[PDB]
Structures are given as C-alpha cells and as structure tokens.
Design a protein around this ligand. Structure first.
Ligand code: NI
Ligand code: NI
Ligand code: NI
Length: 471
C-alpha cells in the first residue's frame, strides 16, 4: 500500500521539470493513499505556490501543520504563501513558529517583524484616492526644464507623435531613460483620457478591420517589442487590447507602461488598456513596479501611477460579441453589462464585490462555484460562463490572469479562452506566449503563439520587496 511514495516520486519529477500542474495532480494521488505524511502536504503546498495559487498553498500547509505541529516546513510554506498575498501579519505568526521550532529562521523572522512595522506605517497613512488631490493639481509638465545634455527622446510640442514613440522605444531597448518632463506629459495625458471612460468600454471593430488581444505582459518589455515585430505596432488600423497586468514581476515595467501609455496618447483608438489586479497599490508595493518607478523616475510618480491605474476600465466588449476581462466572472448570477459599466472604479480593488471578482477570479473545469485557489475572489464553472454570456447576448469570454504552457487554453465548451502574453514567465516557466486576432464581422478567434526573446541581464523582482525576493 506504499503506492503513495510512487506518486510522490513521480510528482517530484514533474516539479524538477517545471510541470507544476502535473506535480500537483500526482501529489494529490499520493495524498489520496497516505494523508498522514506531512511532507506530502508541504510538497503540494509549494507546488501551488509556484503557480501563484496561494489559497491552496495555505490550506495544504495548514494540513501539514495538523499532521505534525513541530514540522517547521509546514509553517514555512504557509508563511511564504501569506507573504505572497501581502499578508505580512498572518505570515509573522508562522515565522514565529519556525523560530520556536528551530532556535539555531532568525533572518526571516526579523525580516518579517520589520515588514510588519513598515506595513503598520503604510496602513496608518492610507487614504482613499478619491479623497486626495491628484498630483496633476501640483504638477505641470510645461514648467519642467529639460537640460541640454539630455540625449533621449523629446516631445517637441503638445502632441505625442509616432516618431517620438519609435525613438523612445529604441532608447528603452538600449536601457536608456525618458526625461521626467516627457514622462509626466504622457501619464498626465493618459489620466485625462482614462477618466472620461466608462467602467466597461465598447470596442467597435468595423467591417474588414481587426484587433489584437494580449494577455499579461508583466514588465517583459523585450517580449512586448517582439509582439510588435510579429504583429505590427499599435495604430488605428492595427489596434491592441492589453488585458491587464502590464507591470510587476518583470523588471522592465516602466518601459512597458510608458510605451503603452504613449501609444494611447498618440492615438486613443490604437490601444485599449484594461485594469488587472497588478495595476493596484497592494501589488505594486511589493512586486516591483513601485520600486522600479522610485528608481527610474521619482516618488511623485508613484502616487500618480496609482491614481491613473484607478481610472483604468474594468472590462471591454468587442462588437457586442466578445467580453474581455482580466480575471473572470462573479459569485452571483444575473450581473448585466450595465452593472459593470456603472461601477465606481476610481479606487483600489476592494476585498469583495464585482470589481474584486472580475479582477481576481479563475475558471474551474467542473460546473458550479468554489473557493479560489488564490484565496481571493472565487472560481466559476462552465455553467456560470454560459449563463452570463446568454444573459448578456454575448458569444465568447476572453480572459487572462493565469499562466499557460502554450500561452492560451480554451475552456468551458469553447465559451472561455485564457490568453497570456508573457513567454518564459519570470525567466523560468518556459511557457509560450499568445495573442488573439479578431477580424470583423465573423469575430472568430485567431490564436497566435510566440516564444521568449533575449533581454539584458536584469533579474525578475529586482526592484521588488526584499523580503518577498527571498522566496
Ligand atoms: Ni493577474
Ligand atoms: Ni498575472
Ligand atoms: Ni497575478
């Protein structure tokens, strides 16, 4: 009856081969047979963590703790999962246990205590963005002088031009920087454009025209350039929809966000940007974007980006047929397009509600609903998808949010497609990226996959929270 070690050994094989999803299924089999081995639970917990399924990680690690309360790896894996969710206070308790069980661990406890104190200050000065003055009230780019020695791209007048964007993109490619005057100009103009948008944007693709939908890119700027090489620069004749999560994790997030915003300023109809869960303060604070901004720009840009992100639309509908959202659907039925359109989105994502769910949820293979693997939002089956599409007279749901081996996956009887545009995610997943072309009137999804492309020697998470980097 020692078939548990059988699956357990085959599971560890998948983990070595970066096949975390297959590793999980095999650990599950080992657990089905022997549910009284704490390392089996810790193993599956770590595997979920690799897929960013921190909710499942916490549950698995809690079970390892139940099996052996003096097994420090149980607390370690749970604490690490809590850290990844930004929940330092919950994590602290577990690292306090790891310390108690291993007195000779000291580093990580002190780091966690330190992180909790930083968090305490941060929460104390936390104020809803709608109650604060925009930095656009204190900053006018016109008054920002550019030194003669600056050799980067310049915006000569009030208009962002294609020549400028090309020059800027090339400089970024060569790891150069854009002057703060022009960065302000781009972001401040983007703010104006975004605040005039409804929370759900209707995209019209005229007869004979097309649009390309990209999933997460996560600061992988050189892969972004590769997408543009393969599929053309954004333009009125070649529009793009980037479905959230343009920043964090990858270490060229500033280069990506300034590029995407610049295209919007150049021609608003050339590019559509939806909010992802990583376009929020709680994620940017720890996953690299704030650190990258503070380094490559200045502190004032942090609050400005935060505000601009809060103006990002939550969903798009293409020709009344294709519904595009970052995460997924809702824990309740009957939600109409009008409900999403009316969402007061000018805020950080709350811990519950429509806005949270559409940004954070994932689909499940079986019908119904259940607890989220990430520990935030919920999971929804094919029945949830079909009812939503039917109720709103839609044909197809496109979303992102989840890393895929081939850059995409068709689920829920063909009614849901995940698209993910960050190849070799974090320089380790080895996955392909994908994007989807839609040509009117048929609007049939044309899926194209691509592979990762070289980039300068900068590590992922280089600008991210130091404590979180240790994991
Ligand atoms: Ni996401
Ligand atoms: Ni993501
Ligand atoms: Ni994510």
């Amino acid at each position: 009856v020692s078939r548990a070690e059988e699956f357990k050994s085959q599971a560890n094989e998948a983990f070595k081969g970066h096949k975390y999803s297959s590793a999980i299924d095999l650990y599950t089999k080992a657990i089905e047979l022997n549910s009284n081995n704490a390392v089996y639970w810790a193993n599956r917990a770590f595997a979920h963590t690799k897929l960013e399924e921190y909710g499942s990680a916490i549950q698995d690690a809690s079970k390892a703790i139940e099996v052996d309360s003096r097994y420090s790896k149980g607390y370690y894996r749970r604490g690490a999962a809590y850290l990844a969710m930004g929940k330092f206070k919950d994590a602290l308790k577990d690292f306090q246990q790891v310390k108690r069980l291993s007195p000779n661990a000291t580093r990580k406890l002190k780091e966690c205590e330190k992180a909790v104190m930083k968090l305490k200050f941060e929460e104390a000065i936390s104020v809803p963005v709608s109650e604060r003055r925009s930095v656009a009230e204190s900053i006018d780019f016109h008054t920002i002088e550019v030194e003669p020695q600056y050799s980067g791209a310049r915006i000569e007048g009030e208009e962002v031009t294609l020549d400028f964007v090309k020059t800027m993109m090339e400089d970024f490619k060569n790891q150069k920087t854009l002057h703060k005057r022009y960065a302000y100009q781009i972001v401040l103009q983007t703010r104006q454009i975004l605040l005039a948008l409804p929370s759900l944007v209707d995209i019209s693709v005229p007869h004979g025209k097309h649009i390309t939908v990209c999933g997460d890119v996560h600061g992988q700027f050189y892969d972004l350039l590769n997408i543009f090489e393969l599929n053309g620069l954004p333009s009125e004749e070649n529009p793009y929809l980037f479905n959230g999560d343009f920043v964090d994790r990858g270490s060229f997030s500033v280069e990506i966000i300034l590029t995407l915003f610049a295209f919007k300023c150049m021609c608003p109809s050339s590019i559509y940007l939806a909010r992802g869960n990583h376009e929020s303060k709680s994620m940017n604070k720890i996953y690299g974007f704030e650190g990258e901004v503070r380094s490559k720009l200045s502190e004032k840009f942090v609050d400005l980006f935060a505000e601009v992100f809060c103006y990002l639309p939550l969903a798009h509908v293409i020709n009344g047929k294709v519904f595009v959202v970052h995460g997924g659907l809702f824990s309740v039925d009957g939600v109409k397009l009008s409900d999403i359109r009316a969402i007061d989105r000018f805020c950080e994502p709350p811990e519950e509600g429509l806005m949270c769910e559409l940004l954070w949820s994932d689909p499940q293979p079986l019908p119904g609903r259940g607890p989220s693997k990430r520990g935030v939002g919920l999971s929804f089956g094919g029945d949830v998808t079909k009812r939503f599409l039917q109720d709103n007279n839609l044909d197809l749901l496109v979303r992102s949010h989840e890393v895929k081996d081939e850059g995409y996956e068709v689920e829920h009887d063909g009614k849901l497609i995940t698209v993910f545009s960050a190849p070799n995610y974090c320089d380790q997943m080895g996955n392909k990226g994908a994007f989807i072309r839609f040509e009117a009137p048929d609007m049939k999804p044309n899926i194209v996959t691509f592979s990762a492309v070289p980039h300068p020697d900068v590590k992922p998470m280089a600008y991210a929270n130091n404590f979180l980097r240790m994991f």
